Amino acid sequence: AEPQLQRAPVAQASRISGTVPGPLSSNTWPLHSVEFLADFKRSSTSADATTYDCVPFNLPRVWSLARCYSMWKPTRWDVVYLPEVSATVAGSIEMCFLYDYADTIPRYTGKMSRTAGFVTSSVWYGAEGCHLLSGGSARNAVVASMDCSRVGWKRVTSSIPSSVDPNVVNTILPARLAVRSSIKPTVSDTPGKLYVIASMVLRDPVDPTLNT
Amino acid sequence: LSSNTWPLHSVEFLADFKRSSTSADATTYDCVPFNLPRVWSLARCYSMWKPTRWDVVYLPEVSATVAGSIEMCFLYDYADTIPRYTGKMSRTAGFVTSSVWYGAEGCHLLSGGSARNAVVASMDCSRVGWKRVTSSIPSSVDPNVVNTILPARLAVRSSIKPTVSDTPGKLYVIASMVLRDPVDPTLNT
Amino acid sequence: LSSNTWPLHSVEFLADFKRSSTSADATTYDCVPFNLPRVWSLARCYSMWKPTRWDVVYLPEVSATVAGSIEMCFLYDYADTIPRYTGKMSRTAGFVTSSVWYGAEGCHLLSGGSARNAVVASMDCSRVGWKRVTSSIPSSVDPNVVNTILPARLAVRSSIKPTVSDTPGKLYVIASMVLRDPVDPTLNT
Amino acid sequence: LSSNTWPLHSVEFLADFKRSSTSADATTYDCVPFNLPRVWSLARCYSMWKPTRWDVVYLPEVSATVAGSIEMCFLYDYADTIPRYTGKMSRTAGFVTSSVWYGAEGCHLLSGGSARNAVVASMDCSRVGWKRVTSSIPSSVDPNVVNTILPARLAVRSSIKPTVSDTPGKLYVIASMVLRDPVDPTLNT
Amino acid sequence: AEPQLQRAPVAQASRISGTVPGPLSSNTWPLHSVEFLADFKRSSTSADATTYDCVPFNLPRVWSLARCYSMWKPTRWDVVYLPEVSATVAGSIEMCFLYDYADTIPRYTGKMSRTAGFVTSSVWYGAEGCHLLSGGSARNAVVASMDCSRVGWKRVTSSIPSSVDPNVVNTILPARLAVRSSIKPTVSDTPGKLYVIASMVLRDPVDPTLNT
Ligand SMILES: [Ca+2]
Ligand SMILES: [Ca+2]
Ligand SMILES: [Ca+2]
Ligand SMILES: [Ca+2]
Ligand SMILES: [Ca+2]
16 A cells, blocks of 8 residues: 655653553552461460551561552451460460550450450360361351451551550551460460451552652 | 440530630630540540530529620631630631520520520531540640540630639530440550 | 531642752642642631542643653652652552643633543542641651641652753642631631 | 532621710621621632621620610611611611610520521621622722622611710621632732 | 250361462462553763663562562563653664673664664654553554563562672573663753563462562
């Protein structure tokens, strides 16, 4: 055919609309995952509960994805206790959630029981929780569920301002998981494992390297 | 109805309406559970609260000859300046004013309803979210930090400087809220 | 509708799109009423505001041969670092880039609105709650405190460094919001 | 609802009811946005306004022993002579009169409704067209020129000459209007 | 009914088989994405081409996901040039790929043309490449495609051993993109942008924090 006589424009707009396509470019992105939280450490001297900040950057794998978004909203967050001790082991594991950073960490059973999301279990009970981490059946699992309803959209951070008014911390920290041992062993030990079954929604992308 | 949630309707004395003989500034009251002993005793057992009502009624107890009036309004931003005069009060949310000796008819508001002849200052509670219950306020902090725990402040002012400081009536709070996540009363801050 | 809630749709010049001949950093604009003189005149009369739209359209006014592009995106966390380059921009929310000379078709967005071949950067307003109207930003504080008042920041970047500092266009904001509890404009901070 | 139009409901302190110890003449107040600081701050952002409500409530703050009463009426023509006495006031539009110490019951009118025992002077707003918003009034001009910008004047009078000038109560404006064509607040005259 | 008389076992095995469930737990995970590579910098003094290592850690968003896997295999890797200059701009952009770290970087057109994946374009041609980044239509785009067939499974790294024998570098570096300017402007400038349209397969998960 005839060679086409192209008309050359002074320019030609180069335009892109919206976050460049890829795995985490959608306005929002829902994510469900099982994440090892920590060892159930049993102090032999302290009766104080151990605290765990329920925020994305504390979940290595989830964090990898979460740092690509600026906002997140927890939908599930459930911590399962997996026993790794015989049925001869005395003691109990106590768990509850603290929804205000300003609130004091429970130092004993009574305090723990009076706190939201409270749960206790024979340190050797709950192995069936292993099946929770995969399929389901929380029938015989030791789980501490965090109240996620009513939790709004939180900014995704890579840190927690700890030496700051608890009120500013609250703006980023939906809740803290408080884990306590009902008794003091003669020597520190680790009766089981704590795995988190988190479900959240990420929103509004951001270059990971900028996210803090 | 359930699962970390139950409504609470209460009535409690808030404070005496004090008229300064020298200052024209408005007195400010933080609308949070810990400023109401009984309500506090309940709210402290929960981690989060959400005001559904919060109304402050002025009930007079002076002679029909006392001059001056009471002015009330709500401040929803800690950073906002406290009204120094009538015009300023009149321009802010929930503004209400009434002769200092009027308002006794609003006592049935304390039990029952009919705010028909009451002197009430209602706080805008719709669209007020869940706030963490606290045992105090960080007064030396950025107002924005305070706003996190303080839904609003009630600003009360006297339209007149009496010859001597005096209290013509009292303020009663009629609050209605919902509490959420259980917490040991002694550990609530 | 009503009851301490006034809806508002405005259009205002936001700022000049400035291109630095030395810095590759983006310029950020705080998406809050006090940054728009006319809108501020209105918003300062209220304690609370809630953005419903907030769109910033770029209107060019340079030769079609000028080199470079304008890049825009929104930052929803004050803690988040300001983009220093195209990828950082292309990777974040509301990203949009267009040749610096392109855009005039966007004037229709201003009057009326038929955004087609318009260069707009829309902010995520859904799920943005009632914020407190302020007259400033506490930059000297924890970014989390700032977040309390800053729904988002618009990030505008020049895809390239002109040999001389210049401004090839202007940014106009098309905001839609609802205002809530009245305050004396002079006491609103 | 839209395209250069949104309703505005406001409440603001208008002025102190001042009783002259020597003059029997009525004091006059121009019912225009610029005489209400906050409302002005809003209205000035628009070129045209149209009053939908405009009610002025008298709220007393004196002893039940003060004698005399307040008289109010509206004047819809700048050329019209200001009422010198009770009969004259009583014969003009919106006329209302009440003992100077009565009216506190009308405070709920400021927030909510029920003008049931209020002392309100309502301006006839139906059939009041769009008027240009102004920052002032040409007082030395033909009344007809003034009528162009002045929907009406509120005439307030004391049915008695107290021994000394005094202010028994205050006047609060409860205005409701619609604004129309945007304008830079600083350029509005 | 009758209370069930539970039989208490000496223990109860706590077992989990396979990487804990979540977004990046599958043995393999395929990922396609558009990633801004860099500015097409035009030196006014050097004629040397600029090199870009075609490896995951150089793609911020992709890297977020890629660091959760230990092995990767490029399937596509295409670099698109987007012009941001008028049709009055003189010069050309030259691109090619170097598949051996030991190979010398081309210093001129002839050298560039003799190299695999070679491509040149009027610096003001190729705006239609914008549509490539989203839908498709590479009909009028300036693209430099990397030979991915025959590229095996490479270990995912967070760095490149640069002061090491090019042969060891080759074990981790599938290829380098060489970008050159056909001419020297009177002063350094940036005629356009380089975006990468990568496609790869990730395999064998690993805690991100361990991945280096
Ligand atoms: Ca962040
Ligand atoms: Ca608390
Ligand atoms: Ca304010
Ligand atoms: Ca005017
Ligand atoms: Ca590795």
